[PDB]
Structure formats: C-alpha cells, structure tokens
Write a protein that binds this ligand. Structure first.
Ligand code: KMF
Ligand code: KMF
Lengths: 304, 304
C-alpha cells in the first residue's frame, strides 16, 4: 500500500533526447526514427520574440544551420520542415533506441509524465496534468524547451506534449507532437493570460477512492448526493462539472471499494464546504486532482 | 520557473532490474556486474513470516532454486550468499547495462528516487525521503520488494535503498545495498511500530527558498529569530532541531535570494504558529519537507 505521485519510467524517452542548436539558441529535440522534433522558436533570437514571422525566419535557415547532437555524436540533417509550431529535422540516421510510439493529443484533465531536459540531457521526471485552461504546471527553466510529456502503455510511448513556453504567471504552454498548441496559446512573447484553473473533479474523486483503498477514510460520511446537486457545489468552488461519463469511468473504483460514486461525491461536497479542518488525505492538505481514475487503478493494481 | 517533486531519470536503473523467484515467492532483484541483489525474504514462505531463521532456511536453497530472469532471458546462478538482509546471487553474465554505481547509506532527511517494480518490470518512479524515524512513505504492493532507491551524480548511480517491507501502519522499511536496515526494523512479520515522524526542518526551509525563487512570497514577514528560539517552536511542532550545519547548508540559497537563513526561520515559525490560513505555497497546503537544499539548487539551476 501507499499512494504516490508517480511518473512513468523514463528510460524509453531518455533514449530519444537530443540537443538542437540554431544560431545562439539551444533547446531539446525528440529523435524518433530519422526525424528530430523540436519547437520552431529554436530559429528565433531574443529580438524576434515580440512578433516572429516563422515562415520568413525559416527562409534564412538551411539544414546545416540546425546542429543536432545525440550524446557527444553529431547527427547529419538532410531535411527540415515546419509543421504548425514544431520543426521536423530529417536526419540521415534512424534513432537505434526508438521505442514503439504514438503521437496523441490529450484532453484537459489527462495526466502525463514530463522528462525535463537541458542541452539534450535528462535532469528529472515528474507527473503533470493538462489543466482545464490548457496550461500545465511544470518545472521548466531556460533550455528546457523541447522536453516532452508522455504516457506508456506497456512498451508503447504515447507522446502528448512538447514544452514551448512560460506565461508571465509562471504556468506553462506547449504543443502536441503535431505542433498544435494546447489551448489558445501562441509561440510569441505577448500578453497571454490563462483562464480559470478549475479543479478536475473526476480526478479528485479517483484520488479519494485511492485514499480509501490505502486506509485514509476519515472523510467518508453518511451522505449521498445527485449529479445536479453536486454540480451546483462544484460550480461554486471552481470544480469541473461531473458528467455521467465521469461516473461511468469511476465505476471500477466504486466496485472495488463498495462506495457508490454519488456517495463519494457527497464526501467531496462536505470537504469543499467544510474544508479539511487541519487533517490530511494521503499526505495532502488539499484535494489532489492530478491522478486520473486510470492512474489510480494502475497504481493500486501494479501495472508494469 | 515552476517547482515540482521530481525524480531522477530512471533509465540507468531500469537497465538493472530483474525478476527473482524462489519457490512460490517472486520479487525484484538489482543486477550490477555479475551480481543480483535481492531481499533475503525471497526464500520465505507465508509460513516462515513470524520467526524466520534465515541461515537455516538458506541451507535448503541451492543456486538452481533462485530463478533470475532479465527481460525474457534466464540468467545462470553460479553462487549465492547472504549479506545481512540481502542475498547476492552471482550470475555467469555481467549486466551489459551496468551503469557507474556506488552503494551509499543515507541519513534521515535525505531524499532519493524509487523505481517501483513488479516481476522485474518498472511500473513507475517517484521521489521519497528517508524519514527521521527511518521509514519511507512509498507506494509498494506485493511483488515490489527488491525495488530500489537511488540518486544520480551526472552518470553515477548511488543506490541507497532496497524495499523489504510494509509496517502494519502502511509505512515502509528497507535496507541499504549492504543489506542493513535503516532504523530498527527487521525482516520479520512481527509488532514493529514506527517512532515519531518528525518534519525535516532544513528541507522545509530549502522548499521555502524554492518558493521565493519561483514567486510565492506571501509568507515572508518582518521578523527574525535565533536558532535557540526557533528550536523551541520546532520542538513544539515535532520538527527536527535546526543546527548550524543546516544553516551553513542553506547558505547558497540564502545568498541567491538575499534572505538570511534566520529570517526564513522566522517566516517558518509564523507559518507553524499561524497556519496557512487557506493559502498555498508552491501548490501545497502543507509545509513540504521532501526536498533537500541540494535538490532545490539542482532543480533551480537545471543540473543534468
Ligand atoms: C523554454 C526554452 O528553453 N526557451 C528556449 C530559449 N528561448 C530564448 C530565445 N527565444 C525567445 O525569446 C522566443 C522567441 C520567439 C518566440 C518565443 C516563444 C516562446 C518562448 C520564447 C520565444 C526561451 C525559451
Ligand atoms: C514486498 C514484497 O514484494 N514481498 C514479497 C512477497 N512477500 C510474501 C511472502 N513473504 C512473507 O510473508 C515474509 C516472510 C518473512 C519475512 C518477511 C519480511 C517482510 C515482508 C514479508 C516477509 C511479501 C513481501
């Protein structure tokens, strides 16, 4: 037993990280097969931050201007193209460590692991969630752009995120591996403010089930609620509305614990209204929302 | 910017995980060079849980009774020996993926990453701290024994922990890689209760410095304190006493932020006495103590 914020093992993704330099800018690239994916802003100077015209800036770049280094070995760039906000650098060598992979575009509320990198070198791994306002709360310094987010299904890595920027509020924005930003963000240093960072209700409920499974039960009460009643309280507390789809997704956890989903909603409703009163749930003094129901089942069952 | 509970990249350790089966018991082993390290309780049945005599149980075990599998390939066991609470299974093949490594015995308050494994297969990675009562708060189900804790210094993995057991309170106990338990715990299913789980004061202070660096500054106050005054409050709140050594260790963070260590102690003192008042620091509603000052510097500087 015990329940931790756990990331996927990062080895399969470490084997894909390369350094990409264009002029004075160095960031990370993701090397899969014979293609290196990286943020297109690698071609920008600090001068081009306000209003970059990427097609125009790219005309001045040739294959030999993109320096790609895998470990201490240089890769030969034989083609380059821009797809949305990412560049795809075709190299003459397929990555010998390319895992089975997919490019997926996740929905808000979904979690993933990030392998934070600097100069093509992995520094750490942590678990994130795509927030309902399409930002992520990561840990990214200068040089971390091009670090990726992913999930693993046994031996297949599903890449879902590539880091591009930090908003002036300290939250992060990026793209899927087709180069499309999550949310309304753009790769421009301009006034971009995030919307409401609502709490992912279905994830909090999943985490309350994890708490019960792992012995933390104090918050269980004698009440029940309905989706409509619960949602009036959820709206008041800036929680995402709970749908019948979320109830169905929590079905296996409800079966395992014998606690009906709406009864867990009533426990959550009292926690929202009454607070924790200085108590903790799974070592947390707030309601954790960065575990999906799948993460809870995975961690509670021991999926490898 | 942004500050996350980050684990080290786990690839170097994934390359070392093997499955070890003895009779009906399957757990994990750590394969370094031509030796596989695993908990000696792999030789126990559920029957032997109350009072195992490991020397006696081991007499009935031969090299061919220890089934070691690396991926889908069996390893040949050519010797076995018991060192404290671990078994060392000599195999005929050196692990080709053996990283540069050290075996270190950590002190309470020190953090490390755990690669949770089942049947020799990695399931996830998370960051832990050796608690002042010599337990860890992990995430370990049946089959996770033999999973290891480690730190990485550039390319050298320092293994500090191997998982052996769960106390009836849900907290975890294990050994260093020489097989010596941290704290007073034994590999016996008996009444073993943990002592006071005090808060690692120097780590909370380090995390308050990380908060200031990353923009969360509301808790900064107009006060200062002394080590003695601070420690009267720390004792009252079950915090570890702060020493001049801890003050010296926080020196670089104090220099970076311009906030004297004793001034940060006075901020911590008011947080202890007044609580958070429903506010958060780095997304936490409690004072986080599982980041050492070295972790904060590492994460804030971008060490790879
Ligand atoms: C996150 C990261 O590693 N970055 C790479 C280095 N840049 C500095 C130079 N680039 C910019 O200032 C710049 C220019 C155009 C557009 C953007 C968009 C997002 C971030 C930076 C941008 C900082 C980011
Ligand atoms: C953590 C883990 O994966 N374990 C391996 C499987 N055992 C079940 C069988 N072993 C015991 O019940 C047993 C016997 C003797 C001594 C101990 C000491 C600690 C834990 C189990 C023990 C459970 C643990």
């Amino acid at each position: 037993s015990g329940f931790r914020k756990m990331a996927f093992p990062s080895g399969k993704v470490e084997g894909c990280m390369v350094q990409v330099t264009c002029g004075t800018t160095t960031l990370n690239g993701l090397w899969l097969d014979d293609v290196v994916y990286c943020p297109r802003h690698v071609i920008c100077t600090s001068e081009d931050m306000l209003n970059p015209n990427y097609e125009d800036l790219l005309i001045r770049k040739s294959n030999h201007n993109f320096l790609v280094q895998a470990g201490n070995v240089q890769l030969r760039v034989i083609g380059h193209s821009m797809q949305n906000c990412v560049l795809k650098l075709k190299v003459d060598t397929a990555n010998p460590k390319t895992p089975k992979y997919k490019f997926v575009r996740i929905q808000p509320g979904q979690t993933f692991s990030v392998l934070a990198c600097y100069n093509g070198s992995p520094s750490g791994v942590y678990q994130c969630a795509m927030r309902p306002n399409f930002t992520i709360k990561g840990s990214f310094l200068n040089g971390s752009c091009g670090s990726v987010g992913f999930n693993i299904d046994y031996d297949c890595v599903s890449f879902c995120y590539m880091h591009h920027m930090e908003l002036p509020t300290g939250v992060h924005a990026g793209t899927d591996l087709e180069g499309n930003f999550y949310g309304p963000f753009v790769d421009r240093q301009t006034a971009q403010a995030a919307g409401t960072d609502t709490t992912i209700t279905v994830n909090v409920l999943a985490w309350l089930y994890a708490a019960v499974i792992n012995g933390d039960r104090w918050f269980l009460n004698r009440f029940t609620t309905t989706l409509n009643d619960f949602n009036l309280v959820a709206m008041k507390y800036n929680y995402e509305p709970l749908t019948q789809d979320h109830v169905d997704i929590l079905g296996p956890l409800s079966a395992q614990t014998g606690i009906a989903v709406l009864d867990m909603c009533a426990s959550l409703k009292e926690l929202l209204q009454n607070g924790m009163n200085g108590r903790t749930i799974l070592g947390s003094a707030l309601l954790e929302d960065e575990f999906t129901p799948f993460d809870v089942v995975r961690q509670c069952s021991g999926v490898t």
